[PDB]
Ligand binder design. Structure first.
Ligand SMILES: Nc1ncnc2c1ncn2[C@@H]1O[C@H](COP(=O)(O)OP(=O)(O)OP(=O)(O)O)[C@@H](O)[C@H]1O
Ligand SMILES: NC1Cc2ccccc2C1
Length: 483
């Protein structure tokens, strides 16, 4: 029967330079939710893309030996290579230079023009800037926007960022300057060609133009709109929670269910900034330490709901202590003992024979429950720390049971077998819960454990502890799961 749809977007990034781990956080965060939602059985569409118009791109191609589009084709090639390297599961990549997007920018602008929502005037702002500009009279939608906030109190996440937008910006909404005559690289206004559509309407409509809105084929739009989550950093929350819902109202379209804004990755001299220069290249981190380590650090160290500071030391600690030592060596210790004592034949689960087992089994279920809650509220660092509490417990379980003492007594084979059974089932739980986060390690762990039944790699298989009630042969050549 038809799966419920879940549409998740990242912001479209500005290719005026190389992307850094700030951009990678948003795209990996989106990828984790997408993979998670697919595992829950949703019909997922995950969109990312590039904002390719503006004076900046013009300058960056002019201050180089190329046309805007040959420059942009180069940068986007590099961005798609990065997402490919990060194993981002985006279902589409929207570019604002492609016809499906530009068509929507022209028609949306002309529609608001014809409705009278956009009118011609002059912008006067701050050096002194003064030029003819089309204005979007958003002020008129103020009352309707506050009613939407009243009916959708969970619209902005986390809730901190909401009361700010309302307290600070909504004073009164001033008419938004939505066009300029001062540059030419962008979508020109059909009814006034010397006008070029500014960032607001151009960038925001990517979420709907990518679903074929106002085209011959609107089937993706009717299927996936409205968006379940727009992801972003805090600096553009007001554009997505004020300008975007008002634009959607003016076009008489359903509004998005949720905007999730995370915090900034900091690097000593403030926010990691493409422009500033204080930049960490995800490619260098993936090349040196591998994909799982780079994905894990991004999602674990930098909590959704606050800012995070990157240090090379903290990266090395997360990689070496959490991944290699805590998880990597739990599996190597377990497989080594199954080989040494049972010659690779893992005895079948029976029940909680040990007195530690009953509450540890209960801990396995309470980990899954705690994980689910954290993931639904987008608390990734808490979801992962909860998983690692369980991994740490599993390591402790080896110490508490002392399997090598049980191996001496020939009458303690039932209990030794039961200890090995609980070790592997604990590892299975951890492997399944990490599938949205780590693309390589879970696969490798199932491989070396010789778990081939694909049902046992899915969330539904965590409902009842002890699914392996058949003898299984684990690898006789265990190797490091990481890097
Ligand atoms: N330091 C950062 N921390 C977290 N997310 C970031 C960071 N920098 C960029 N992002 C992500 O990328 C988006 C910003 O996109 P953009 O292409 O404008 O890059 P930028 O670094 O903000 O640009 P610039 O440095 O020129 O202001 C954010 O909304 C967020 O999704
Ligand atoms: N942020 C940039 C995106 C965009 C699109 C069109 C015109 C200018 C700009 C500025």
């Amino acid at each position: 029967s038809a799966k419920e749809t879940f549409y998740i977007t990242t912001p479209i990034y500005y290719p005026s330079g190389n992307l850094h781990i700030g951009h990678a956080y948003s795209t990996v965060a989106g990828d984790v939710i997408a993979r998670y939602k697919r595992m829950q059985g949703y019909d997922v569409r995950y969109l990312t893309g590039t904002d390719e118009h503006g004076q900046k791109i013009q300058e960056k191609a002019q201050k180089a030996g190329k046309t805007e589009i040959e420059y942009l084709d180069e940068m986007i090639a590099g961005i798609k290579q990065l997402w490919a390297k990060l194993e981002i599961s985006n279902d589409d990549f929207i570019r604002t230079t492609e016809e499906r997007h530009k068509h929507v920018v022209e028609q949306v602008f002309e529609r608001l023009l014809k409705q009278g929502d956009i009118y011609l005037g002059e912008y006067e702002g701050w050096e002194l800037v003064k030029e003819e500009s089309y204005f979007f009279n958003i002020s008129k939608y103020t009352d309707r926007l506050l009613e939407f906030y009243d009916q959708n109190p969970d619209f902005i996440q986390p809730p901190s960022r909401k009361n700010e937008m309302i307290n600070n910006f909504i004073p009164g909404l001033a008419d938004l300057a939505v066009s300029r005559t001062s540059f030419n690289w962008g979508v020109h206004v059909p009814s006034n060609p010397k006008h070029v559509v500014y960032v607001w309407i151009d960038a925001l409509v990517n979420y709907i133009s990518a679903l074929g809105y106002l085209s011959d084929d609107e089937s993706l739009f009717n299927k996936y709109w409205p968006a379940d989550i727009h992801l972003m950093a805090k600096e553009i929350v007001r554009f997505h929670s004020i300008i975007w819902p008002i634009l959607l109202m003016a076009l008489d379209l359903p509004l998005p269910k949720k905007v999730f804004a995370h915090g900034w990755i900091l690097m000593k001299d403030g926010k990691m900034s493409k422009s500033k220069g204080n930049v960490v290249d995800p490619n260098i981190l993936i090349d040196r330490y591998g994909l799982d380590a780079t994905r894990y650090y991004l999602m674990r160290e930098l909590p959704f709901g606050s800012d995070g500071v990157f240090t090379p030391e903290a990266f090395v600690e997360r990689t070496n202590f959490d991944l290699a030592n805590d998880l990597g060596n739990l599996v190597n210790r377990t497989i080594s003992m199954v080989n040494k004592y049972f010659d690779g034949e893992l005895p079948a689960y029976q029940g909680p024979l040990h007195e530690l087992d009953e509450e540890m089994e209960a801990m396995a279920l309470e980990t899954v429950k705690s994980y689910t809650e954290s993931m639904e509220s987008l608390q990734f660092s808490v979801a992962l720390s909860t998983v690692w509490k369980f991994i740490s417990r599993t390591n402790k379980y080896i110490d508490e049971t002392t399997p090598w003492v049980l191996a001496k007594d020939d009458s303690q084979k039932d209990m030794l077998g039961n200890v090995m059974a609980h070790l592997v089932e604990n590892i299975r739980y951890a492997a399944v819960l990490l599938r949205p986060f780590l693309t390589h390690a879970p696969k490798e762990i199932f491989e070396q454990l010789n778990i081939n039944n694909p049902q046992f790699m899915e969330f539904s298989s965590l409902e009842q502890y002890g699914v392996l009630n058949e003898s299984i042969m684990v690898t006789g050549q265990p190797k490091p799961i990481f890097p």
